[model samples]
Target: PPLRGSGDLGVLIERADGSVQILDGTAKTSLARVEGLGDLSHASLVFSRDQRYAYVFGRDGGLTKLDLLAQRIDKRLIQGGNSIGGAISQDGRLVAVSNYEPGGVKVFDSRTLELVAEIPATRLPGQDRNSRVVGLVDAPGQRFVFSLFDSGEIWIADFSQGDTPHLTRFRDIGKQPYDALISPDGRYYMAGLFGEDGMAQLDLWHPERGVRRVLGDYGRGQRKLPVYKMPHLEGWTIASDQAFVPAVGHHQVLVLDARDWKQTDAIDVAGQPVFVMTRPDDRQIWVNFAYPDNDKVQVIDSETHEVIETLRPGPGVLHMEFSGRGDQVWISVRDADQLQVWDPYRLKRIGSLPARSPSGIFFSHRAQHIGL
Candidate 1:
């Protein structure tokens, strides 16, 4: 596999027999198929910084390495724990997979497929172990963060030593921390809560004091006609000094000023917005709707913060990835057994490739020639 740089795309499709399909983005066809992903009902994929291999992990438990160049399964390593979420290092040297059942996270070598470290999930100083590890994030400069599904806690780990990493856990100022992101400058860490009504913000420079609910009551005065779940913002992103907060309660992406945690503007998405991404040019924002009901990709005008267009790929559209050239967006449709490619600007379906049950996708632009 090549690096997911400025121009490559890889598609991950789940097989009925518990496996994954690795596809070439160019021809819209599969390059290789790896079996024994390990009782994976749902999973996620991430490429190394160089895009030499794809790290595939079962949401329940299991981790496998797919050699992109040879198009074969190189290694299979089981952490002996219940893995529901995981993430790869920015440079792809380290990988972190979360275990929900045990409420902890396991670290592995991205290349050799070896165990590196582990961090048990826990709440604040004197809290219980009701937390479940769900979201894992690897920021720039070898920094890692994992979210606790119930305790609203985010664990921080640094791997600057190349092999051994230090793990630290911090609690969010809310009930559940579902998703999170570190600022581009690496100055702040932000997360969206599940049980609260807003997002939590923490000064990465001083994490000892815990997180703060800077953006209180997300979608404050919007037309929340039929109010949705608590802490409605499911996914969020931090560019430099701004955060794009997507909320199903407000049915919009709440643009917040990261400096003072103020509502800069709210972008109307019209559907139940789940995840969001910014275009390379930062002119448009791409949003993915939730599963079992909505099946549309809402594109927003970053400048105007308004809904531009909607695209339907298939049922259960969970996540999305993009090509290096920034010309195409590859989305995982769980029920479709195929990866859907869309022209982000036109907001229309361009093509669809055969897949099993793709959930999470990552691209390797450097490894462009798939030889499919």
Candidate 2:
């Protein structure tokens, strides 16, 4: 059955059964369920500019274009053998996918889903060319920036004109950039390196300044504890003139001065932080952790940088998302098979949605935002 109105009225849940279910978050009811998506173990979703379609990137190299109004899959393509995730251009004309199989990025037309350009992860002279691409993001000026996991470099593809993209590559970007995220304003792109203790940042506004290392030697010669899960770059947030970042293998959130990109302070947390998210109102920042402490979520006051409250939402809390205006937060509890909604200010559980091993909770409202 087709959805009754514009796709902007519902929330999409990525289920463990390789299907997606649409639910009206406000109404607290199920809308529709679409199946046949393959290996959604590590899937991501990005909506069209008008919120009419959803681009689902599956781990098994499947790119499914789903029409939200029709409540059906419009087009599906297997572009690679293995894909991590993707991003849509600012103008909403192009869709880009980052692949691990052949280690490259492919861009397609937003309307036709036709191949427009391909940027392989080719390294500099004497370096390996087949490195996996990660931390893919779309910046203003029609540019797509990504990092090479194997070759330790960052490449920016400028497609301001047409199919022919002008590229700028920054070599020696640090080892094994696992993932990256752009600032809310899209002026800065930061990549988290796995092979080292620090991260690399690039100011999109001043390309000539090049890449600079921030949070230097955060590990401080201490042996890194075993990381059960990889921390996400999307977990980073900016508020109160500071950027809240997940300290890898440490139970703390590093607060950086957004003005000069210097480490200003650290917020001790319950466990290794996985997601550091800001409330929609920018009043509070929420922190989630990896297993053993996954059931707990902590709230930090944006102004004072103090732990204001901690709540046990559920077991195996994998992800958290807030309502469009920050009135409530929706959390995915994988082991519990449900999504828990919380009132951030009141510090109480308000609602719960039935789900089957849900991983990511995405709302249609993301269409109007950047770096979603």
Candidate 3:
């Protein structure tokens, strides 16, 4: 059964049964379901741009392709390693999976589930073999793909036919490049360093010159109040020309001038900022801070960098995705077996879906569906 006027909204959940569930996002209910995924932990889900299919890759290396229009499983493929995280190509034609345990990247054909390319570290420079990948993203034309390895640097792969992904070292980024995202406009690529008093930045157009150190070392005792320990980085967001980075240890979201890589302003927030989201209109910025204790999503005015509102849609929100219309936002609460949806502008809780440990979410603005 489907939720009436669902607007093709669907939810993907990692069930306790080691499977994934598809639910109704628009109507705030369940539509159809899928199961039998094995020991796949902390899975990441993404949908093609056309909204025709959904890609699910999980722990211990399991990649399953789902046909959305037909409501069936299309194909399943494995590339021989555990994948902690991954991202879809710019056109959504290819899926790049991060082989964490084996320390490499596997690129697969999104629709056919075929291993189109396997980029080994041996072909790369300074690719730390002990380094595990935490994040992966592709540029607009699929011209370059980036992998944020836990060992402290980002790897760049050129999509040109005969070229393998070249590895460049950005040591100033600090110990761990936990998660990263490339701006939608394809102008800048950024990484979040989660260790020590660390922060890093990168220019999307030039990978060889390497990262620019944007924020680091708040200088404890040097400020009015003693700066806390470890302003660890987590999730982040990029707007028209600014990048909003959540500094968890400092309980502040730092706004950076994307062009100059300078710290423009910082917003005082509550909880350890875990995720940062920029509204489609670019007027408001949302920050999710779930650490030490679990609660609250802080809303800040983009222009003023002031705390506008604090919302509690659900508990333990680790990540979020906004609808194409930009009217609604969906969240994955790891602490509860549910998916929470909110009216972004009103800061009101609109709906919830029953599920377990939903972590990552993706929305196809074209089709108005939510991918888990």
Candidate 4:
């Protein structure tokens, strides 16, 4: 079989089958399916710099290297007890996974999936066990940054000096940072706190400044709403110089001034925002929600800060991915077992394809960007 160019390549998670479907966005079709991956209930992936491979991190601690061009699992292994997600290094040679059961960040050689380094998330003094790791992301200068959920800390593993990473730790950033994202330019690294109403921010450019709290007390005094699923800080959706964030318990997507990290405005949406993502062009944002309100997806105009349109694609809308040039958007409707393609500009469905309980829709362009 002849392989296509990398630009149009993509991989979709078949959660039920523990497999991934190779997608060709330009043709709006599924190219192939690579199977035998274990437990994908909470699966995530990152791509190599060449965009030819996808490193899948499974909830059951399985790390599978998928060759997109060949449409097969190049290598697979269960490196830990359980994992949340993973990231590829700046040079795309080191693949790092965030673990929960064993609680550590494990790095591997991108080419052969060989063990490179193991960073145990044990920061507190006298702590008997390792803390669950979250928000693991690759930063500039061959650095991997992540949060320690149990200890309320952050750590940076710098591999710039070669495989023996020089690790840096930030103690007590907040209580239970479940997830986080580095800014588009790799300057700011913000983690969403599970125990507080604020977010912890670390200026990666200046480590001396330390991690400070942002959007503090914004949800203070308000009755907390039950969060079915924590919002993913996916892609750090910043469009038109405003950072659009999903506010916990607030049913509102917060707009923060990117420059000052202050509250600018917020837009009330149909439901609790789960993945507030920006288009590649930075013109509009497409948002999905948590369960109970998961069927709807809303599009917000970046400049107006208004939900310009809303679409009821189907039940259980899990993820969304924009085309390379941002001409179209592909979304997953898990319950319906379908992938819906939409024209964000015209606000209409353009295509649809059958999928088996899809959860994540990732494009090759992800390989070019920092932070998954």
Per-model TM-score versus the true fold: 0.79, 0.92, 0.79, 0.94
Q: Which residue runs of candidate 3 sit more than 4 Å off their true CA positions?
A: 1-7, 122-134, 147-154, 162-176, 192-202, 206-211, 216-234, 333-336, 366-372
By TM-score, the better pick of 1 and 2 is: 2
lDDT for each of the candidates?
Answer: 0.67, 0.81, 0.64, 0.85
Pick the winner on TM-score between candidates 2 and 3.
2
Worst 10 residues of 3 by lDDT: 218-227
Minimal lDDT window, size 10, model 4:
219-228
Better lDDT candidate (1, 4) = 4
In model 3, how large is the Cα lDDT of residue 141?
44
Candidate that would win on lDDT: 4
lDDT of 2: 0.81
Q: Tell me how far the alpha carbon of residue 59 in candidate 1 is from the true structure, in angstroms, after superposition.
A: 2.2
The C-alpha RMSD in Å for every predicted model, in order, reads 5.2, 2.4, 5.1, 2.1
> Native-vs-model 1 lDDT?
0.67
Candidate 3 per-residue C-alpha lDDT over 109-128 given as tens digits, one digit per residue, 9 for 90 to 100: 77787777776543334653
Identify the runs in model 4 with alpha carbons over 4 angstroms from their true place.
123-128, 218-228
Whichever of 2 and 3 has more lDDT, that candidate is 2
Total clashing pairs in model 4: 0
What ranges in model 2 sit over 4 Å off? 1-11, 123-129, 219-230
Between prediction 2 and prediction 4, the one with superior lDDT is 4
Which window of 10 residues has the lowest lDDT sum in candidate 2?
219-228
